[PDB]
Design a protein around this ligand. Structure first.
Ligand SMILES: N[C@@H](Cn1cc(Br)c(=O)[nH]c1=O)C(=O)O
Ligand SMILES: N[C@@H](Cn1cc(Br)c(=O)[nH]c1=O)C(=O)O
Ligand SMILES: [Zn+2]
Ligand SMILES: [Zn+2]
Ligand SMILES: [Zn+2]
Lengths: 258, 258
């Protein structure tokens, strides 16, 4: 049985090739996770079909209905067999799906235009002339919602009631907002993404300060999946072979344009 | 029943308290992993007994005898129920025991006596005046033994054949060797340990270059253990609540001597 892989369009993890018009199936896509999927499938010995998550979300549980959305939801309800994407390993998700050991390490970071008078999270929390937000239905927004750290909690009380909404549906929207806000908007996002964007023209953004936390991305499978064990050992093998480092250089700096 | 925890004397994870002869049981020890063990036990709801691994090793399988030694061996043969220490999550180990998601991220790094003209692994491999080695019998040594990467294999070729041995029995032994070498010995060790030593008197060592790889430490349990699931969720909860960052600051920098 062909394995249904759920993923999300997030550069440089999964992007449609420039010549996708003449391509079909998994060939239409390219990116870090596309290469990863091929490796995993090869080592675990299975055939697969890459599918972009229906609602374009990573995964969160509806407080009122208790229904899971995003890629997590597709695994939970059996719409997909495995998720290969920049999906953060978290406690709430681990309670409903399985995660392989991390294939990438990262942390929340700050993205600023360039010339923006901000160097840390504390700086952002000390002023109000510059707005800031995060992505939606993701671990970043949840981080601030659950954080007890003085600075992070203060930032949340602002973002929560901010008008207009400082949250964005997609990373692209957030980066675009930073670039066109004359430096009046800072974006909080996962470090790996921040670093990628800093190497993309117009080369007008930059990562400032250290990461606010430590976390990792993992390959997810529904609980009780016959793929779980094999996939986990596959990720470890690939990391130990140095393939994962090989893949990040390829998509992050070998293609950098700054 | 009381849970038997195997761990290892490796500063600052587990250390003998100054007046340990005056104390009993778990109170004889102090450190990052001692603090972590208490927290894992509280959150998982079990009583425990800290024990220091008999052979003072982390864990490897002897080719020929097929017997596992170190903390891994204590779990494999049922001498301990859980291992809470700076134990690296590796494929070969994952095949015989279970690991929680990582509680600490790190990579192999280079430690030099201040002033040593070395800035990378490539630098080390391209010269011979400066000797270098690793902790014997651990995942760092195995990384070089198993690596297929040119630079790292070249380093392995030299280290395995060096006489006298460039390998050391304990981290302290390696650090002392760097300190007494007048710059003629560099030490390859896990990054977080390198960082710890850099903050200890006489403040004569430092970490140089980037990490050679990326991996993490995990809490280990025997396969099929009834504790596995709970321990994993506890680690994720503790990381998300910021405790792990708190513990590193406490044992690394709050007590920094440089
Ligand atoms: N990895 C997250 C999604 N995600 C992604 C990016 Br990029 C970001 O900046 N913030 C997030 O929460 C998850 O798994 O929810
Ligand atoms: N973490 C390793 C042990 N270990 C420890 C230190 Br500190 C080091 O520098 N190298 C190692 O291999 C393992 O699990 O074998
Ligand atoms: Zn391969
Ligand atoms: Zn709702
Ligand atoms: Zn606690």
């Amino acid at each position: 049985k062909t394995v249904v892989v759920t993923t999300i369009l997030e550069s440089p993890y999964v992007m449609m090739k420039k010549n996708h018009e003449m391509l079909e199936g998994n060939e239409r896509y390219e990116g870090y996770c596309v290469d990863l999927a091929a490796e995993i499938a090869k080592h675990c010995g299975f055939k697969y079909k890459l599918t972009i998550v229906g609602d374009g979300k990573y995964g969160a549980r509806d407080a009122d209905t208790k229904i899971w959305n995003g890629m997590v939801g597709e695994l939970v309800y059996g719409k997909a067999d495995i998720a290969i994407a920049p999906l953060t390993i978290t406690l709430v998700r681990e309670e409903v799906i399985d995660f392989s050991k991390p294939f990438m390490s990262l942390g929340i970071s700050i993205m600023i235009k360039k010339g923006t008078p901000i160097e840390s999270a504390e700086d952002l929390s000390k002023q109000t002339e510059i707005a800031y937000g995060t992505l939606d239905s993701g671990s970043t927004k949840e981080f601030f919602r659950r954080s007890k750290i003085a600075v992070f909690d203060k930032m949340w009380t602002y973002m929560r009631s901010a008008e207009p909404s400082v949250f964005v549906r997609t990373t692209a929207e957030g980066v675009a907002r930073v670039r066109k806000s004359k430096g009046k908007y800072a974006y909080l996002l996962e470090s790996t993404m921040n670093e990628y964007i800093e190497q993309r023209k117009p080369c007008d953004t930059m990562k400032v300060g250290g990461n606010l936390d430590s976390k990792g991305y993992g390959i997810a499978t529904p609980k009780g999946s016959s793929l779980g064990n094999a996939v986990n050992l596959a990720v470890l093998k690939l990391n130990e072979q140095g393939l994962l480092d090989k893949l990040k250089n390829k998509w992050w700096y070998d293609k950098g344009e700054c």
